[PDB]
Design a protein around this ligand. Structure first.
Ligand SMILES: CC(=O)c1ccc(NC(=O)c2cn[nH]c2-c2cc(Cl)c(O)cc2O)cc1
Length: 215
């Protein structure tokens, strides 16, 4: 029987859209820092569930294990980063990942057009958008306690969508799926992933596991 699914389409806040075009359409060396930003975001969300569980242990009913998995797929050309952090409500996605102005956006674009290296992005509070250095499309699947699982998606161009996710259930957390650009397939290679995690994400306070499919 035919299933029906509600979708909502949103416009990025004007300077966020400007930042995304600047990230996509300008050449930057040091694109590898996208992964540091993703891991640091997962780490922050894991911190939130960890401390929030000291008050209310039943917040870990949706899974006790606090960790980060990296999953390259050479046939899909995707790299997926999964955490079991606190997750995002529907309103969190809509607000935190596109519609609400971020106070650091302008400063960052100014710094970057004066020659700052792209690695500075995290300090400006817009580090998520570094995903578009390497990815043509980003999907963020998320599950927060007491809310449904949602899917956010954007290929930039000024909009994003949000929908209730009817895919594979997660207990709690956030899964980011990077559909990589054709010239950025190095970030599917075991050695390269291990290299940049070692260089940039060495002191993360949760275990990270890299899952590699048999060649
Ligand atoms: C705009 C920006 O850079 C940004 C960075 C991180 C967040 N994180 C969250 O809101 C959050 C809350 N729970 N889980 C997350 C989360 C978000 C992202 Cl984008 C991620 O990659 C991993 C997460 O755990 C939101 C915005």
């Amino acid at each position: 029987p035919m299933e029906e699914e509600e979708v909502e389409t949103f416009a990025f806040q004007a300077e966020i859209a400007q930042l995304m075009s600047l990230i996509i359409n300008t050449f930057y060396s040091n694109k590898e820092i996208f992964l540091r930003e993703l891991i640091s975001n997962s780490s922050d969300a894991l911190d939130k569930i960890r401390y929030e569980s000291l008050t209310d242990p039943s917040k870990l009913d949706s899974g006790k294990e606090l960790h980060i998995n990296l999953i390259p797929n050479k046939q899909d050309r995707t790299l997926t980063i999964v955490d079991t952090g606190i997750g995002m409500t529907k309103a969190d996605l809509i607000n935190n990942l596109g519609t609400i102005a971020k106070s650091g956006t302008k400063a960052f674009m100014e710094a970057l057009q004066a020659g700052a290296d792209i690695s500075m992005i995290g300090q400006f509070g817009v580090g998520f958008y570094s995903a578009y250095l390497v990815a043509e499309k980003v999907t963020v699947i998320t599950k927060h306690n007491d809310d449904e699982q949602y899917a956010w998606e954007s290929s930039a161009g000024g909009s994003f969508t949000v929908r209730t996710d009817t895919g594979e259930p997660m207990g709690r957390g956030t899964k980011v799926i990077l559909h990589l650009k054709e010239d950025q397939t190095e970030y599917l290679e075991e050695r390269r992933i291990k290299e940049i995690v070692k260089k940039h994400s060495q002191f993360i306070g949760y275990p990270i596991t890299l899952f590699v499919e048999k060649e």
